Specification:
The structure is cut from a larger assembly and holds one copy of chain A (91 residues), two copies of chain B (7 residues), one copy of chain C (82 residues), two copies of chain D and one copy of chain E (97 residues).
Chain A lengths: L1 E4 L9 E2 H4 L3 H7 L7 E2 L6 H16 L14 H13 L3
Parallel strand pairs in A: 1-3
Antiparallel strand pairs in A: 1-2
Helix pairs in contact in A: 3-4
Chain B lengths: L7
Chain E lengths: L1 E6 L5 E5 L5 H12 L7 E3 L27 E6 L20
Classes of the chains: A mainly alpha (91), B little secondary structure (7), C little secondary structure (82), D mainly alpha (571), E alpha+beta (97).
Bound molecules: zinc ion (4 copies).
PDB class: protein binding
Keywords: E3 Ubiquitination ligase, protein binding
Entry title: Structure of CRL2APPBP2 bound with RxxGP degron (tetramer)
């Protein structure tokens, strides 16, 4: 029901499974021998992975919403590092 | 010039 | 069995591109002078490029240029409404 | 005399020649140097080196702080938009994205961004990028409506007076009323806490919003309310704006005595503070030429529009909406002035240039195309009549048939069916159908044109009387309804005499119609009389157009502020 | 709706609750994952204790500050909240180097 | 209904908005993220920031390696060349400098620089900057020339076949002839040391060189050699290119039963592999619409040029050679299709557009203006005779006279004096003078075109007969030289039925003239015979009309390559 | 319409 997400800094980021299935790579983490499930994100630091998890609650809540969806804020100092994590996670 | 200018 | 059926022209563009009114409304020619004595025969015409316009609008367009307004192809009617 | 270059200018050229290596260090220069390095890149034609830095909000915010050299920034920016880089769209989007990132931040930064957004959004509004200045101001307005501090409502209206200006020029009138209603929300709440904010610029925008929709009775209501709030301590830009819009609303109310003292003061007031080569001064001239064209002072009206265009052709580069509005206004005046001559080559060139700019920068379904297409179509239908080729005559009329009905739909969709602009497009279709040998359709357009012009405007008006003469000319010259043209010719002349006297230039087309009226039915005694009246009009017409150009009519220091307003208010 | 996160040392639970939802069932949500007694657990927003009786919206966790993209954080104590990391500070560029 | 934005696309917008502080750390991003950032610079309108980031080969090479999104790269690249940023010229110069430095360096490093050059030179050849891809390919030729062993001989011939392509399309035929001889040396050199390569790519590439120089007899000879070398291991792009040029040369040899077999498979093979929105598949359609234009199937040829243009109008932007050659082909076909109807408005628009593109991207003395300015002149000389205005009658004929003289000068400079293409423009001059009423030179130009075309093409061809009908109409309608005009009419009428059939569209313009020659002398008995078959010609037109789009004529999997490559050769 | 199409 929940997915235990750890970062490169060892931070714990347990999030609901339906939120973490938005990204394709985490779906591969939960599939196979990986199946709270421990997942390793040794290359993704915690300051950029926190924004990834904030997107999951932002993505799932705002699916097929009738109202104007606010843009996800991604700060300039994190945007480049978050972009690499967005590609790797297929988020 | 059989008419006036355009409004 | 009483039934209700909305009829409409099966174009998906649903806007004339000459008069720029709705494809189901009257053309700008028939919506300016007489909208009751001329509205009955203000039909729409398609083309080989499958871009339907108001027949009044497309004829008024062909009186100057011989191409479809949207894509510059040779204009030839394929069907009308009547 | 071979004066050596300054070491400053010589060092500009040395740094620009080594721009690529030192492009990072130029961004840390003082603003006066930094603008001059960037202006030299434009002068050298290196728009890609220059445009790759103007796309950054921080760099452009630094070159916006050089207030004296804004006449060069408005000319580099326009050259950048023509060059193919969307710096206005990027800077509006780069600001809005950055503005939304400090919503949860402190109010110290949140007030610096509004300062940046007013010099940026006010620049884009000045440059003519209303669709992009609106995106900046909507972000500035969003900053004012998060923390409910005393100063914030003072700035939320200051956004909503500029957010309303960028929607009047963009023809978002249906959002314009929503903005003014939103403006009073913070205006009333500010007035509750012992602070009556000056409602002078805000009320002046409705003098242009409601005039644009031709709510002349409603526009004049807010024309008075705007000038009651003019104070000598106000900025000249705010004061000049109200006087222009008040003049525009006064002329369309068929009152000219109060209108001349406002705009002529405004032309001088803009020429004093700003200068003779300022965008704001050219804005007055177009509104000043609006007076001269309407009051039949047509000979000097072309020069005022040409003077306005020459200012905008220098400050605002090649393809700008401010150059285009000057073109479509000068083309109409050149159409009116050269209507008697019949030669339309300068007028058609300006009318074609105006549509060539508007179609390039604005969408093809935009309201400013209604005025530009109308002006060219009036010129097109009059070129074909004056030429002798039948094939050209049958083509230019149909070419002008496309424009009027395309223009009519733009007015009908936005302004609605019952409005002056929609009726004014019917009158042009009345001229159009008469010249296309479709005589029966020309009558039903004129009747529809009058019945709308007569209704909202009133019985006696400039607009309704000008179209009666066309209907009178239709009943007279070609469809042989001589019994109906007699009362219409007199009705047009009676209104023309009331507001213009014997100096009205359209009486020639009315007196000549009256001569043709009786030569086919009888009563030849009035033919000699009306020919004498036409003769009396002829030499009286050659008495007033020889007055000097209207540019020096305002002279220097004719009157003073806080006195022209009072003179207007009492009368 | 209210979206928020809870942190004790390095944990972060991205759970949600209604604007009228109370701390009582929110604390029981923590027991679903942390499998620890709820009475021992105490929560800490901006160095302030929260009673279980009052709702989440009564303590200041309104929807305006609990957006899914920028959730409001609240500490957890059985405070040793570990910061995530320092992002690489970009040069000011406009500042002279 | 308002789906949320992807985190990737949201981070792309945030990185692009943060360009100034991160314009150099983007170059350290992965391969697939660099393109998406640089695409967002195009989408946002930041062409000035993107132009400075595609003029550098160090970062543009990583962009080129994104093969999935190459259709977006062609439209960004064309956006900058339209923008004013000479990206192709700088990348040619940025690679010309690079090759010289690596030339002294290790040969293994030279292998990497050659592979980059094929990707960059191949792109600039695909994008249509042939003059700027020749410089890249010449630089790649220098690296392979320096070393002489088995490893670099495969690349040296690969440079030469690619260098031949960027010169055939650039109308540098005087250099394309010698570069095959240079390529001929490396084929023999590779064959000497016990190694055999594929000659299909090279033999079939010069088939366009000979076709463009109107050496149709020699072009067909090399097509047979090209078809011999087709094997199963060749890439589809190579097989499509050799099937395209084989079809083009089979048409001008007046055997259309075999050109259709080669171009229908080429259309299917290009569509099956490259898809329906690929610039290579668009290249096939222009050669497929070249076949249908020359077999009197004009009604099915406009729909193919319009389909080939729409691919090149979307894959490539405006002001490009590939969207210009698609206009000038469609402007000619719409001129031919609307020749009887007289609706020369779409055809003139597609002719003026191709004029405004070539004069912007090519020099005034380029040979591709010969075909572009000709097609505009043919449309102009028919608009004026269609309208009923006097002042425009002299202006349009005079303006069309300038283009044909200009088209003749460029053709004569490159093809010499006795050439089919130069003689083709002579026939256009003859029709020009007939409308402009300078009959003294009209007979000279028409008989000069006939003399050269019959001398080289032959006495039995489609091209030679069309010029005869132009001269035959000159004698009949105005010159009144009926004693030899009737011989000319029967010559063109008989050959038209032999080549195409009784339903050939050009027979109507010959029937009307030949009847008018008979009514002018009073012979009314033979007139009734033609009016008995002129109605039959109209009757035959009703059955042969049958407008079905030729895009689905090729269907799905008619044959395979092995059957098509042998059916052209077994029948040969 | 007198002659044929251009080559
Ligand atoms: Zn319509
Ligand atoms: Zn209609
Ligand atoms: Zn169409
Ligand atoms: Zn640029």
């Amino acid at each position: 029901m929940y997915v235990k997400l750890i970062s490169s800094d060892g931070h714990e980021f347990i999030v609901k499974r339906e939120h973490a299935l938005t990204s394709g790579t985490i779906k591969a983490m939960l599939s196979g021998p990986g199946q709270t499930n421990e997942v390793n994100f040794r290359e993704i630091p915690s300051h950029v992975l926190s924004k990834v998890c904030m997107y999951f609650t932002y993505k799932v809540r705002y699916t097929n919403s009738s109202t104007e969806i606010p843009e996800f804020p991604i700060a300039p100092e994190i945007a480049l590092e978050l972009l690499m994590a967005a590609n790797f996670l297929d988020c | 010039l059989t008419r006036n200018k355009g409004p | 069995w009483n039934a209700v059926a909305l009829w409409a022209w099966d174009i998906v563009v649903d806007n004339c591109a000459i008069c720029r009114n709705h494809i189901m409304d009257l053309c700008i020619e028939c919506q300016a002078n007489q909208a009751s004595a001329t509205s009955e025969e203000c039909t729409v015409a398609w083309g080989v490029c499958n871009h339907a316009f108001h027949f009044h609008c497309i004829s008024r367009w062909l009186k100057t240029r011989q191409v479809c307004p949207l894509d510059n192809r040779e204009w030839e009617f394929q069907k009308y409404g009547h | 005399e071979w004066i050596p270059e300054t070491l400053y200018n010589t060092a500009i050229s040395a740094v620009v020649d080594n721009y690529i290596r030192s492009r990072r260090d130029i961004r840390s220069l003082p603003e006066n140097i930094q603008f001059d390095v960037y202006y030299k890149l434009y002068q050298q034609g290196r728009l890609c080196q220059l445009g790759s830095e103007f796309c950054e909000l921080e760099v452009f915010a630094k070159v916006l702080r050089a207030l004296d050299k804004r006449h060069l920034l408005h000319h580099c920016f326009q050259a950048l938009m023509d060059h193919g880089v969307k710096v206005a769209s990027v800077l509006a989007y780069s600001f809005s994205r950055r503005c939304s990132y400090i919503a949860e931040s402190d109010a110290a930064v949140k007030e610096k961004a509004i300062q940046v957004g007013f010099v940026l959004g006010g620049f884009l509004s000045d440059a003519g990028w209303y669709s992009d200045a609106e995106k900046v101001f909507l972000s500035c307005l969003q900053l004012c409506t998060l923390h409910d501090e005393m100063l914030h409502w003072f700035r939320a209206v200051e956004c909503c007076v500029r957010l309303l200006h960028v929607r009047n020029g963009n023809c978002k009138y249906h959002l314009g009323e929503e903005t003014f209603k939103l403006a009073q929300t913070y205006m009333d709440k500010l007035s509750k806490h012992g602070q009556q904010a000056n409602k002078a610029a805000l009320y002046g925008e409705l003098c242009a919003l409601l005039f644009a929709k031709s709510h002349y009775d409603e526009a004049y209501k807010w024309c008075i309310e705007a000038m009651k709030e003019i104070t000598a301590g106000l900025p000249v830009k705010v004061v000049v704006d109200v006087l222009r819009q008040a003049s525009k609303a006064c002329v369309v109310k068929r009152e000219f005595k109060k209108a001349e003292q406002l705009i002529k003061h405004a032309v001088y007031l803009a020429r004093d503070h700003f200068g003779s080569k300022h965008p704001k001064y050219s804005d007055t001239l177009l509104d000043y030429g609006f007076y001269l064209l309407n009051v039949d002072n047509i000979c000097q009206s072309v020069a005022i529009y040409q003077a306005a265009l020459d200012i905008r052709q220098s400050v605002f580069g090649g393809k700008n909406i401010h150059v285009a509005t000057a073109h479509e206004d000068l083309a109409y005046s050149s159409y009116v002035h050269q209507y008697s001559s019949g030669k339309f080559d300068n007028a058609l060139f300006h009318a074609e240039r105006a549509i060539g700019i508007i179609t390039h920068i604005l969408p093809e379904d935009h309201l400013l195309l209604a005025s530009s297409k109308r002006v060219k179509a009036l010129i097109l239908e009059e070129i074909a009549i004056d030429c002798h080729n039948k094939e050209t005559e049958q083509r230019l009329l149909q070419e002008a048939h496309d424009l009027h009905l395309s223009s009519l739909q733009l007015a009908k969709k936005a302004f609605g069916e019952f409005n002056v602009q929609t009726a004014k497009h019917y009158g042009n279709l009345g001229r159009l159908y008469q010249s296309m040998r479709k005589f029966k359709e020309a009558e039903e357009m004129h009747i529809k044109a009058i019945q709308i012009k007569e209704q909202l405007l009133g019985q006696e008006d400039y607009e309704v009387a000008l179209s009666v003469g066309h209907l009178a000319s239709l009943y007279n010259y070609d469809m042989n309804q001589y019994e109906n043209a007699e009362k219409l010719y007199l009705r047009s002349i009676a209104i023309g005499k009331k507001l213009f006297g014997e100096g009205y230039s359209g009486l020639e087309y009315d007196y000549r119609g009256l001569i043709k009226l009786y030569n086919s039915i009888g009563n030849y005694e009035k033919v000699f009389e009306y020919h004498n009246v036409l003769s009396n009009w002829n030499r009286l017409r050659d008495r007033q157009y020889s007055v000097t150009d209207a540019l020096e009519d305002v002279s220097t220091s004719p009157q003073s502020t806080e006195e022209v307003v009072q003179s207007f208010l009492i009368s | 709706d209210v979206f928020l996160m809870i942190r004790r040392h390095k944990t972060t639970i991205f759970t949600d609750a209604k604007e009228s939802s109370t701390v009582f069932e929110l604390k029981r949500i923590v027991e679903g994952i942390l499998k620890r007694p709820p009475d021992e657990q105490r929560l800490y927003k901006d160095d302030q204790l929260l009673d279980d009786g009052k709702t989440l919206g009564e303590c200041g966790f309104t929807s305006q500050t609990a957006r899914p993209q920028a959730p409001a954080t609240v500490g957890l104590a059985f405070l040793c909240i570990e910061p995530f990391s320092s992002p690489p500070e970009l040069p000011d560029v406009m500042k002279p180097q």
